[PDB]
Design goal:
seven-stranded mixed β-sheet; pyridoxal phosphate binding (chains A, B); globular; Aspartate Aminotransferase, domain 2; 13 helices; homodimer; four-stranded mixed β-sheet; 36% helix; binds (3~{S})-3-azanylazepan-2-one; Aspartate Aminotransferase, domain 1; Aminotrans_3 (chains A, B); binds pyridoxal-5'-phosphate; 16 strands; alpha/beta; Aminotrans_3_PPA_site (chains A, B)
Chain lengths: 423, 423
């Protein structure tokens, strides 16, 4: 039987998030190859995980090398050279002598470890996060995505401003209200995405995040910046907070850090990560195969000038999309930084009413045409584009061209679409 | 500076479990190589993760192949061929048409997903587990290692029988007591290790586990067998429950499944893993590089006859150790199955008083001599031996020979040992 039907027979639905019957057998560059040999351009970049695309030589080199002479299998009960070299590279990239690293398998395990560490270091359980935030899918990362003392704030959206205040100041006022109503010093941490991912690739208003961080610092609250989606060159700066005029206390990394292998990291003050031992650990954490891949990703970002590539190619992509908006009225807003781009689809440009149903057919048709992308947003109406940082300019143009065909040929049965749960 | 000091400077203590300053730069076969070039025989097999040791050709082949042509990076929003092939191989190995697979990064994420799935499928939160059990190190796997409705039982130890009943029947009676005091049907699952790992490599009494599973089945309670430590050929059968006259409802796998890469799996009734979608998911789950490694491990177990190897080489190891016991009185008990072996150290053979302090020096000295092993047990007095399944017979003998030197040359300052937290 076909690969997709074998996938239904053999793998439980528990971890599936399917939008169309993508059945992959290989990959090269920014393209996926299906079982039948059909190629698709991957604008999703595996939700951002395939930072160097598929079969990049630096990944091949590193993982093949480490597999043939691995420095053990772990950082728990052994130091290993690749893990320590990666830890030093990551701390050197982050504004010296103050921070250390913890390694994980995923953004979920990293946000969980950051939260457990700061609650253990401070003796406080309270936590600030945002409605619609995505910090992972484990009990400990879902606690704030519940924790006692959880404060959930609206994420300020330029396209849908809270209290009709485009600046986000009303959100800051709400925070101060929420903090005033609980004891001084009861809040351990604030988790923030510097571009809200599942919330709909929302770039906050100018100045908001720095003012938010200033409030947190006035209350002694650690500012944790989750850059699992938009970190490591994707935004057109190495770290996305570089666009925003603040430095967080803690940085969470994942997804594209591993280049297609499972790798996450927390960069945090030494006192936070040294407050306990044998406390947040999984046996394969810091294994040298995945550490080697991480080192390859950082080295490639430098060697291939991918921070600048992401900036340049993002501008190309957003320009392509604004040409599409001249003819496809469904496009309401085009936004993002670098190669993290969102395209919000609306039934009408004036009311901004979300276009959920059309977005799910759009991506299905795109898939039928040879282009992979997914949707996000509380209303299921934002196209997410996070392609491999190594996607060529011509591929960017082929993808916009296929998207133009999908907006035009918008054909997919309401029955065919209903076969996929998605979200 | 030296690698171990760089590890202290760069990596937080949060995930460290260190017993001596092992600082690894490479690996080959069953040997680790330190930064200075010193070789050590790895009796720990990276806590059981290095099922094929270090740089095994099947791992090299598979991971190099997949890195150069990866079928995407995930099972969430795409099917992929390696993941589905691995899922089918795993279900084919487990007693047809009833079970599916969920893929994870770790034993912690797998035991967490198994627990969340069965609680979602049943609408019940209660859970049976054992004192001293190790099911992982995340909030969701620590919940039963707390969950409402948690019942914790003593694990029956032939060397220290509960209520002086060597059979374990008193533990079964205790269970029934605990179940009688809560509503019929309030318990979702029972988590069991078929050889208790951190509890001290405890093989339960004959017949206990089957009688335990029979009780659970009489109450409609799903029996989850955590074989992250002693699964996949290590015990001298493919699945350790094969020694025990029962079949669990759910099987949890990890550690050596990945051959040094992060890979876990839950094999569970279809109704359990299909009760929700987009429910327990992490982006790199089912990535094809780690799936390829898993397939290599299963293929190698078949090609290299490693189930029989583990049985044969375990008998050799335990025989070697009984020769050591004729001269080293500290050895109280030698136990286990296949290549999961525990050696319990006692101050006196008659009282069985644990020998904690000597065990920690012993392993330090072993390390100084070129042999890596760790200790476990509630009293820190059981040597754990879980070497690579590909460890040669001669290496088994070199390791017993180095251990003999360590028991003899037992030299390590009480100050030097105190520099390592361990547990
Ligand atoms: C992907 C993502 C996570 C979770 O990472 P997983 O690898 O799926 O566990 C956390 N935060 C953000 C912002 C993400 O995009
Ligand atoms: C190692 C182990 C776990 C946890 O696996 P991690 O990879 O450390 O998360 C779970 N159960 C048992 C029996 C184990 O030995
Ligand atoms: N004994 C368990 C817990 C210690 C950390 C690593 N995993 C194990 O082998
Ligand atoms: N948008 C998040 C959550 C969906 C599952 C995968 N991870 C992501 O990219």
């Amino acid at each position: 039987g076909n690969l997709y039907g074998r996938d239904g027979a053999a793998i439980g639905s528990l971890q599936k998030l399917r939008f169309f019957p993508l059945a992959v057998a290989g990959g090269q560059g920014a393209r996926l190859v299906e079982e039948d040999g059909r190629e698709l351009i991957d604008l999703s970049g595996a939700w951002g995980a395939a930072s160097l695309g598929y079969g990049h030589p630096a990944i091949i080199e590193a993982v093949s090398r480490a597999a043939a002479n691995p420095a053990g299998a772990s950082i728990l009960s052994a130091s290993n050279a690749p893990a320590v070299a990666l830890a030093e590279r990551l701390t050197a990239s982050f504004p010296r002598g103050t921070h250390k690293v913890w390694f994980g398998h995923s953004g979920s395990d990293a946000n969980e470890a950051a939260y457990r560490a700061i609650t253990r270091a401070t003796g406080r359980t309270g936590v600030i996060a945002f409605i619609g935030a995505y910090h992972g899918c484990t009990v400990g990362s879902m606690a704030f995505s519940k924790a006692d003392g959880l404060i959930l704030l609206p994420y300020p959206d330029p396209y849908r401003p809270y209290q009709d205040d485009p600046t986000g100041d009303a959100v800051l006022a709400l925070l101060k209200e929420r903090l005033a109503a609980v004891p001084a010093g009861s809040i351990a941490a604030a988790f923030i995405e510097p571009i809200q991912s599942d919330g709909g690739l929302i770039v906050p208003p100018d100045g908001f995040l720095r003012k938010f961080a200033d409030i947190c610092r006035a209350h002694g609250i650690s500012v944790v910046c989750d850059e699992v989606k938009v970190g490591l060159a994707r935004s057109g700066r190495l770290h996305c907070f570089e666009h925003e005029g603040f430095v967080p206390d803690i940085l969470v990394l994942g997804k594209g850090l591993g280049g297609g292998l499972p790798l996450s990291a927390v960069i945090a003050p030494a006192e936070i990560l040294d407050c306990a031992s044998a406390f947040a650990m999984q046996t394969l954490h810091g294994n040298p195969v995945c550490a080697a891949a991480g080192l390859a990703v950082l080295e490639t970002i430098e060697a291939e000038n991918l921070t600048t590539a992401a900036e340049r190619k993002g501008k190309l992509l957003r320009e392509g999309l604004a040409r599409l908006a001249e003819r496809h009225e469904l496009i309401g807003d085009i936004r993002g930084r670098g190669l993290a781009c969102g395209v919000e689809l609306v039934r009408n440009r004036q009311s901004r009413e979300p276009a959920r149903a059309e977005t799910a057919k759009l991506i299905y048709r795109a898939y039928e045409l040879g282009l992979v992308l997914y949707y996000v947003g509380m209303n299921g109406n934002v196209l997410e584009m996070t392609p491999p940082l190594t996607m060529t300019e011509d591929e960017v143009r082929h993808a916009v061209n296929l998207l133009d065909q999908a907006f035009t040929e918008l054909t997919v049965s309401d029955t065919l679409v209903s076969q996929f749960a998605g979200w």
